[PDB]
Amino acid sequence: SFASSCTEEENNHHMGIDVIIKVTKQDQTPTNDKICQSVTEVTESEDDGVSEEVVKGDPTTYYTVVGGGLRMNFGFTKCPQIKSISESADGNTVNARLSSVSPMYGIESPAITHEEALAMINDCAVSINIKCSEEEKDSNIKTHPVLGSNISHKKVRYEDIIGSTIVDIKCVKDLEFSVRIGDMCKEASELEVKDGFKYIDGSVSEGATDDTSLIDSTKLKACVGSLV
């Protein structure tokens, strides 16, 4: 049930996901504000060569965002599709935002039942892997503005969404993360959830909290996707 706009209908939700992330690199790291160097998509459930099993696990789409002196890898398993990936940098910090796109922008997306949405909320899991990059090529920024999920990072019901968070401490000092799942047309109280953590000074704090100002989104730049 795809639609490119927001209509009034029960048990018919345009569910989306919006990931925001702010990384503070180590001082002793080489300068690199060259964001959106590359963005690649790939979906594999550990299903390929050398890894055969009787029971194959859930497939997982990985997004690798190279820029700002970092290689950011995000793994989504059973989550609303990601259609927009933006980034930005300044100083030793690099911000990135990965999300679905709301029918409000005129993009079409699936509308799922209230029940199907609750299960998705339960299964959807996001993995985080952040490595250093020496990549020096030019930013490959899009010509058009960043489209959004229409979901805000306000404090709402907590949901164990975020999984493994692995980072190369050489270039990564601090790291703040926020994940939001909800209706992209109109907030549905029971289907609005969020997960997040604040890795500061080597310490991790978890839980839902207001992150509407984690990053200044107006600074974000749309990254162009590529392959191979």
GROMACS .gro file of C-alpha atoms in nm:
model
  228
    1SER     CA    1   0.000   0.000   0.000
    2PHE     CA    2   0.224   0.278  -0.131
    3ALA     CA    3   0.116   0.641  -0.143
    4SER     CA    4   0.308   0.960  -0.214
    5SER     CA    5   0.107   1.166   0.031
    6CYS     CA    6  -0.052   1.167   0.376
    7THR     CA    7  -0.413   1.053   0.399
    8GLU     CA    8  -0.648   0.980   0.687
    9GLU     CA    9  -0.677   0.605   0.757
   10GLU     CA   10  -0.670   0.370   1.057
   11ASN     CA   11  -0.434   0.076   1.089
   12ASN     CA   12  -0.248   0.221   0.792
   13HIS     CA   13   0.080   0.378   0.898
   14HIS     CA   14   0.368   0.518   0.702
   15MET     CA   15   0.631   0.393   0.943
   16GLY     CA   16   0.982   0.535   0.920
   17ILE     CA   17   1.321   0.542   1.086
   18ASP     CA   18   1.554   0.837   1.138
   19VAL     CA   19   1.912   0.802   1.260
   20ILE     CA   20   2.115   1.099   1.377
   21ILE     CA   21   2.477   1.075   1.487
   22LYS     CA   22   2.742   1.316   1.611
   23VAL     CA   23   3.107   1.206   1.631
   24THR     CA   24   3.386   1.401   1.803
   25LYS     CA   25   3.718   1.287   1.657
   26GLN     CA   26   4.044   1.279   1.857
   27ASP     CA   27   4.257   1.597   1.839
   28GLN     CA   28   4.555   1.398   1.715
   29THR     CA   29   4.356   1.300   1.406
   30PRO     CA   30   4.433   1.445   1.060
   31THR     CA   31   4.196   1.715   0.934
   32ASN     CA   32   3.911   1.602   0.712
   33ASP     CA   33   3.585   1.794   0.666
   34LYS     CA   34   3.543   1.632   0.325
   35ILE     CA   35   3.198   1.485   0.388
   36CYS     CA   36   2.998   1.259   0.157
   37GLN     CA   37   3.308   1.118  -0.007
   38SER     CA   38   3.107   0.804  -0.076
   39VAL     CA   39   2.791   0.618   0.027
   40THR     CA   40   2.738   0.255  -0.065
   41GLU     CA   41   2.444   0.023   0.000
   42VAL     CA   42   2.458  -0.353   0.045
   43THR     CA   43   2.223  -0.618   0.182
   44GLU     CA   44   2.351  -0.950   0.313
   45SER     CA   45   2.245  -1.189   0.590
   46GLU     CA   46   2.592  -1.344   0.618
   47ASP     CA   47   2.431  -1.556   0.345
   48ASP     CA   48   2.722  -1.557   0.099
   49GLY     CA   49   3.033  -1.764   0.037
   50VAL     CA   50   3.219  -1.935   0.320
   51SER     CA   51   2.924  -1.888   0.556
   52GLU     CA   52   2.673  -2.168   0.506
   53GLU     CA   53   2.419  -2.256   0.776
   54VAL     CA   54   2.106  -2.464   0.813
   55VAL     CA   55   1.911  -2.160   0.932
   56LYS     CA   56   1.995  -1.826   0.771
   57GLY     CA   57   1.948  -1.518   0.988
   58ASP     CA   58   1.766  -1.193   0.914
   59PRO     CA   59   1.911  -1.009   0.613
   60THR     CA   60   2.080  -0.679   0.689
   61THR     CA   61   2.130  -0.368   0.479
   62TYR     CA   62   2.454  -0.186   0.549
   63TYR     CA   63   2.522   0.174   0.466
   64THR     CA   64   2.877   0.294   0.456
   65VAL     CA   65   2.932   0.666   0.468
   66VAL     CA   66   3.289   0.772   0.400
   67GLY     CA   67   3.374   1.130   0.492
   68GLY     CA   68   3.505   1.358   0.765
   69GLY     CA   69   3.801   1.124   0.814
   70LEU     CA   70   3.568   0.840   0.904
   71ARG     CA   71   3.414   0.525   0.759
   72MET     CA   72   3.069   0.493   0.914
   73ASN     CA   73   2.890   0.164   0.876
   74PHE     CA   74   2.528   0.119   0.983
   75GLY     CA   75   2.344  -0.208   0.982
   76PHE     CA   76   1.968  -0.211   0.962
   77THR     CA   77   1.779  -0.538   1.013
   78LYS     CA   78   1.401  -0.542   0.965
   79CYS     CA   79   1.366  -0.163   0.968
   80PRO     CA   80   1.180   0.095   0.760
   81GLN     CA   81   1.379   0.160   0.442
   82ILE     CA   82   1.646   0.427   0.437
   83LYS     CA   83   1.604   0.675   0.153
   84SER     CA   84   1.803   0.979   0.262
   85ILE     CA   85   2.160   0.999   0.389
   86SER     CA   86   2.315   1.336   0.472
   87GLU     CA   87   2.631   1.453   0.649
   88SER     CA   88   2.825   1.755   0.770
   89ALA     CA   89   3.146   1.849   0.948
   90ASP     CA   90   3.340   2.123   1.121
   91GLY     CA   91   3.616   2.117   1.378
   92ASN     CA   92   3.681   1.760   1.488
   93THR     CA   93   3.313   1.670   1.475
   94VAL     CA   94   3.125   1.488   1.201
   95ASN     CA   95   2.746   1.454   1.195
   96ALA     CA   96   2.539   1.223   0.982
   97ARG     CA   97   2.167   1.161   0.944
   98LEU     CA   98   2.015   0.851   0.790
   99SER     CA   99   1.635   0.824   0.762
  100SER     CA  100   1.323   0.719   0.571
  101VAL     CA  101   1.138   0.985   0.367
  102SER     CA  102   0.786   1.102   0.456
  103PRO     CA  103   0.502   1.101   0.201
  104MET     CA  104   0.486   1.468   0.301
  105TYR     CA  105   0.778   1.543   0.073
  106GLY     CA  106   0.597   1.366  -0.206
  107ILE     CA  107   0.798   1.044  -0.185
  108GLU     CA  108   0.603   0.721  -0.174
  109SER     CA  109   0.650   0.472   0.108
  110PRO     CA  110   0.466   0.165   0.243
  111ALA     CA  111   0.182   0.206   0.491
  112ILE     CA  112   0.155  -0.084   0.734
  113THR     CA  113  -0.104  -0.195   0.986
  114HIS     CA  114  -0.083  -0.092   1.353
  115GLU     CA  115   0.003  -0.455   1.434
  116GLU     CA  116   0.262  -0.495   1.160
  117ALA     CA  117   0.420  -0.174   1.288
  118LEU     CA  118   0.443  -0.299   1.645
  119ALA     CA  119   0.630  -0.611   1.528
  120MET     CA  120   0.866  -0.407   1.312
  121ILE     CA  121   0.934  -0.188   1.616
  122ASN     CA  122   1.022  -0.507   1.800
  123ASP     CA  123   1.245  -0.660   1.531
  124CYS     CA  124   1.412  -0.352   1.385
  125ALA     CA  125   1.771  -0.325   1.509
  126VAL     CA  126   2.050  -0.085   1.410
  127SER     CA  127   2.419  -0.172   1.428
  128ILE     CA  128   2.706   0.078   1.444
  129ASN     CA  129   3.065   0.039   1.322
  130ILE     CA  130   3.295   0.342   1.295
  131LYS     CA  131   3.647   0.325   1.147
  132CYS     CA  132   3.911   0.582   1.050
  133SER     CA  133   3.948   0.698   0.691
  134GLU     CA  134   4.242   0.864   0.518
  135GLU     CA  135   4.028   0.920   0.207
  136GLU     CA  136   4.100   1.257   0.053
  137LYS     CA  137   3.873   1.274  -0.254
  138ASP     CA  138   3.618   1.555  -0.296
  139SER     CA  139   3.271   1.555  -0.137
  140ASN     CA  140   3.016   1.404  -0.374
  141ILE     CA  141   2.718   1.612  -0.255
  142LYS     CA  142   2.372   1.607  -0.421
  143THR     CA  143   2.229   1.913  -0.601
  144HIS     CA  144   1.889   1.900  -0.430
  145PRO     CA  145   1.809   1.970  -0.058
  146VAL     CA  146   1.795   1.703   0.210
  147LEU     CA  147   1.455   1.530   0.230
  148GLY     CA  148   1.332   1.424   0.573
  149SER     CA  149   1.151   1.152   0.763
  150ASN     CA  150   0.922   1.406   0.927
  151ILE     CA  151   1.003   1.238   1.263
  152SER     CA  152   1.149   1.449   1.547
  153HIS     CA  153   1.397   1.332   1.809
  154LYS     CA  154   1.183   1.419   2.112
  155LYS     CA  155   1.181   1.200   2.421
  156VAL     CA  156   0.930   0.919   2.373
  157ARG     CA  157   0.878   0.554   2.467
  158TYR     CA  158   1.208   0.367   2.490
  159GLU     CA  159   1.276   0.069   2.265
  160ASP     CA  160   1.580  -0.157   2.259
  161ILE     CA  161   1.674  -0.081   1.900
  162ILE     CA  162   2.048  -0.005   1.898
  163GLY     CA  163   2.269  -0.313   1.889
  164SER     CA  164   2.647  -0.350   1.877
  165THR     CA  165   2.842  -0.022   1.874
  166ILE     CA  166   3.201  -0.071   1.759
  167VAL     CA  167   3.453   0.213   1.710
  168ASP     CA  168   3.820   0.274   1.641
  169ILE     CA  169   3.926   0.474   1.948
  170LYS     CA  170   4.227   0.606   1.756
  171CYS     CA  171   4.017   0.859   1.563
  172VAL     CA  172   3.688   0.843   1.762
  173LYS     CA  173   3.675   1.029   2.097
  174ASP     CA  174   3.309   1.092   2.183
  175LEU     CA  175   2.993   0.967   2.012
  176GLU     CA  176   2.624   1.056   2.049
  177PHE     CA  177   2.345   0.853   1.884
  178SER     CA  178   1.964   0.871   1.858
  179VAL     CA  179   1.722   0.638   1.674
  180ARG     CA  180   1.354   0.716   1.616
  181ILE     CA  181   1.078   0.497   1.475
  182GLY     CA  182   0.728   0.634   1.424
  183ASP     CA  183   0.458   0.758   1.189
  184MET     CA  184   0.588   0.992   0.916
  185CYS     CA  185   0.250   1.156   0.862
  186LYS     CA  186   0.116   1.194   1.213
  187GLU     CA  187   0.256   1.077   1.545
  188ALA     CA  188   0.076   0.766   1.670
  189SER     CA  189   0.132   0.769   2.049
  190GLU     CA  190   0.183   0.390   2.079
  191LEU     CA  191   0.402   0.354   1.769
  192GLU     CA  192   0.650   0.630   1.854
  193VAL     CA  193   0.972   0.491   2.005
  194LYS     CA  194   1.337   0.586   2.037
  195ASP     CA  195   1.676   0.454   2.147
  196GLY     CA  196   2.004   0.639   2.198
  197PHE     CA  197   2.328   0.661   2.391
  198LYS     CA  198   2.597   0.912   2.481
  199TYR     CA  199   2.952   0.786   2.471
  200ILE     CA  200   3.141   1.072   2.638
  201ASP     CA  201   3.485   1.054   2.801
  202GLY     CA  202   3.485   0.676   2.764
  203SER     CA  203   3.151   0.643   2.942
  204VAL     CA  204   2.818   0.525   2.803
  205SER     CA  205   2.481   0.657   2.907
  206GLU     CA  206   2.172   0.498   2.752
  207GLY     CA  207   1.803   0.572   2.732
  208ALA     CA  208   1.549   0.787   2.553
  209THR     CA  209   1.602   1.162   2.586
  210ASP     CA  210   1.524   1.475   2.387
  211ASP     CA  211   1.771   1.508   2.098
  212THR     CA  212   1.604   1.773   1.880
  213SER     CA  213   1.924   1.972   1.913
  214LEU     CA  214   2.184   1.699   1.893
  215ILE     CA  215   2.284   1.837   1.554
  216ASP     CA  216   2.196   2.142   1.348
  217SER     CA  217   2.026   1.977   1.054
  218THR     CA  218   2.029   2.286   0.833
  219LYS     CA  219   2.404   2.218   0.790
  220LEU     CA  220   2.357   1.864   0.656
  221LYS     CA  221   2.440   1.787   0.290
  222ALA     CA  222   2.278   1.506   0.090
  223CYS     CA  223   2.527   1.234  -0.001
  224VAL     CA  224   2.514   1.063  -0.345
  225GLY     CA  225   2.493   0.685  -0.351
  226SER     CA  226   2.721   0.464  -0.555
  227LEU     CA  227   2.830   0.101  -0.595
  228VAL     CA  228   3.129  -0.133  -0.635
   0.00000   0.00000   0.00000
